[PDB]
Design a protein around this ligand. Structure first.
Ligand code: ORO
Length: 224
């Protein structure tokens, strides 16, 4: 399938510069199965963050690698399928900040699809992993794809708030700071930072203050 077939219209145009790289990663995953190795998430979920409208993205949440545990990774950073229990530690931590910052009760489950619908891009820098082998697909070719995605997002004549939850600020800030209406939430605690900087970081309320300050609508963060 060409990009226009795999991702939303705006994303297919945004990702044209890395269309050969996206083809190549498809070949890599087929070669992994031939090699007798597995990957997550499911092939159908790998580009899932790019199936929500490129023009409507208001917030970027950056992760590093998909969940390594079988049955966790669903192609949106930190999300899990609605029947997954208990939550992964990172997600439990995110939901504790969610209740504290926003005053909402604990979500009913770990499915962040509503954030994706509302223009929250849940982007991992690396979109696949070998099950039970954390960070096993680093350097396989995803970094160039997700860099093109972020630079394209930054280049829009449109507001963006970046939240960095994958700790690589010195690699990510240059891709973004080259934008016109991008605010980066600093500092950069990750959800596993927990009480050493993540809890009380107010990422959700701060993103809305920053969007309203750039003349955009806030995100409705409320999960079921
Ligand atoms: O393993 C994690 O907590 C994790 C999941 C995910 O999607 N992204 C990330 O950076 N970490």
């Amino acid at each position: 399938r060409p990009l226009s077939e795999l991702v939303e219209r705006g994303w297919a145009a945004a990702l044209e510069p890395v269309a050969d790289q996206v083809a190549h990663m498809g070949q890599f995953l087929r070669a992994e199965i031939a090699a007798g190795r597995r990957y997550l998430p499911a092939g159908s979920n790998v580009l899932r963050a790019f199936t929500f409208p490129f023009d409507n993205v208001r917030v970027l949440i950056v992760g590093q690698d998909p969940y390594p545990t079988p049955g966790h990774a669903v192609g949106l950073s930190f999300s899990v399928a609605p029947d997954v229990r208990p939550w992964p530690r990172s997600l439990a931590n995110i939901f504790d900040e969610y209740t504290a910052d926003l005053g909402y009760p604990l979500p009913s489950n770990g499915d962040l699809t509503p954030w994706a619908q509302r223009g929250v891009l849940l982007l991992n820098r690396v979109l696949t992993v070998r099950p039970s082998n954390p960070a096993s697909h680093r350097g396989k070719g995803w970094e160039a794809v997700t860099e093109c995605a972020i630079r394209a997002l930054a280049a829009r004549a449109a507001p963006l708030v970046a939240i960095l939850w994958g700790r690589d600020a010195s690699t990510l800030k240059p891709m973004l700071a080259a934008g016109n209406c991008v605010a980066i939430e600093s500092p950069h605690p990750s959800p596993l930072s927990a009480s050493r900087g993540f809890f009380g970081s107010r990422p959700f309320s701060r993103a809305n203050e920053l969007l309203v300050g750039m003349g955009a609508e806030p995100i409705d963060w409320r999960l079921p």
